[PDB]
Amino acid sequence: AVRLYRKALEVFPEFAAAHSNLASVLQQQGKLQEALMHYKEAIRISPTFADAYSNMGNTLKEMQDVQGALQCYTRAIQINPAFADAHSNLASIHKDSGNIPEAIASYRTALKLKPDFPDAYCNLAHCLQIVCDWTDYDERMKKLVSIVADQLEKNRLPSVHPHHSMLYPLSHGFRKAIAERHGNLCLDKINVLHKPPYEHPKDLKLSDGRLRVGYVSSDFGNHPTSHLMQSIPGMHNPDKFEVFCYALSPDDGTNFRVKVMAEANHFIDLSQIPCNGKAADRIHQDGIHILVNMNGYTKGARNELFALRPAPIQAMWLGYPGTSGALFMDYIITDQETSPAEVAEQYSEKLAYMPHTFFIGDHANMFPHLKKKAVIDFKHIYDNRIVLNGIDLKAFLDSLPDVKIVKMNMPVIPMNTIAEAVIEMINRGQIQITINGFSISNGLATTQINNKAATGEEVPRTIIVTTRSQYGLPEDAIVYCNFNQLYKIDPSTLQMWANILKRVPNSVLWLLRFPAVGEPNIQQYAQNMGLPQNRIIFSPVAPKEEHVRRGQLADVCLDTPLCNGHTTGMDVLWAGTPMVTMPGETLASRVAASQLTCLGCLELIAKNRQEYEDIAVKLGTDLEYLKKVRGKVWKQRISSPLFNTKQYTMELERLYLQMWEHYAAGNKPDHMIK
């Protein structure tokens, strides 16, 4: 194809269509710079060649030249205002840039021009999901399902991304099939390297009896992945394991990256090795026994590495809440609550069970200042109106007279001169004050005091004050929260929440501007459900530490059934906040119930929507019961396995050895569910 094309150019250099076709093929091959040369020839030969501009824009996009891509799409549309593809491509630039209203407008233009346009319709559907625009929602869902069905039948890559497929009422069969098609994109890409299969280790002799485990991630740095597992590499037992971390991203300068680089036995920066064949060779050279895929179909993934099968056992872990659908992945690390044996068919991988939950979080290490708290009695005694946290909080409390200890142990500071000064700082919006030599910080001002503490890179070194007044929350009412991105909400979920709010007069729902353009849509739908504006309170997204800390102000978290809080679920639990959940069928919809089961709070898991409402309302109205459940969460976040990274790592190690012994005995992968 390429050698034939080049000959056609050696024969006839002024062949615009040919240049543009040769560029496209080169693009597919990953030879982006070479492709650029030919697109440029095409547009010189014919200044009105809109298709070439559009395709050139695609190439620039892949080269990470977003502004250049936008310029190309813009020229294409100027040359041909009715060019539907170019409008859709422009919309994608707007989308990826975070400008959803502009994306929506451009996709709508694309669909006006070409009503049968799966990529544009499905991308528009995701935009609408992001901002909670549920206009014609039921019909939209039906159309998405119909589009996927048609594309699968016709052997075309589906327009619904596998990560997004969790959000739509697709069958498990369809969801797995979408994932499988993406798996195949990877196989096709590496097939062209014509690399032979790798010879894999058959024992642990060359590694001195240690199992060599490779963790592959684009998220070793400031990203949820590291916020969950950054302690795990350093907790592996060096007598039995040798840990290799393979980074798909450059060093972002954060302490998260520092920690993993310092604690892994080996750290390899594959961001410096763009070729998947060479990168796979490097992994194979290291002698990895179990290679762990921490991306799945998420940003930064290089699943081509796994398609090349450099290791004898390859497992999905933690980073992607779904199946890879890919034959080159052997196992998915999960648990009996998240992925009961009954639904093994939803997954291409064999199930490998951790004993409690597969979920983990680094909160005990990142946010140890939240292990204990004190309150200020600004009047009964509340545990979530005015809260103090700090490594040195006990010493501060010991410097005060008349501190009362409330038992069920929560220290309570009485309304005195000290308490007034703390409250005045908050009311005045002051950054910090000093009391008895101790540093007392306004929890809204962490970035001005220590920006590394604000992001979770360092433990705060001051005592922090958190109050309902900082966020405009009522002092005399129940606060239900949900701190997820708004895309996780659907009409049925908001209706449930409205039903709860109507049954609990003295209550509000606390949501985030995530993004802010979703706020007006949620508010309109709430109003249509008969809830006045003041029943729902919005706050901005906050730095990581403030986000986890402020969860202490809520009474109850109402989890999203469509796709649960994952990281976000761990965050809320660490603050001691009960979370009500309704597990569904997909992995993404069952994570919160798995977290709660490990924690030991079965009473917070609902079997259906009526039970979810009833549980939420009981917590909001039976105040002794609320005190009991909050007490249970507060204690069990410490005593349960949920946040115990050492225990988790040890259980992971047991699982790895089971996988290895199974392979070493000559067996192909099978479920590890006992």
Binding site: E62, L157, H161, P162, H163, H164, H182, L185, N222, H223, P224, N295, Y297, T298, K299, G300, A301, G319, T447, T455, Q485, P540, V541, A542, P543, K544, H566, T567
Partner: peptide
């Protein structure tokens, strides 16, 4: 967060 950045889980390009 406004004035900073809050990384989240998101899909890869296709």
């Amino acid at each position: 967060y406004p004035g900073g950045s809050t990384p989240v889980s998101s899909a890869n390009m296709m």
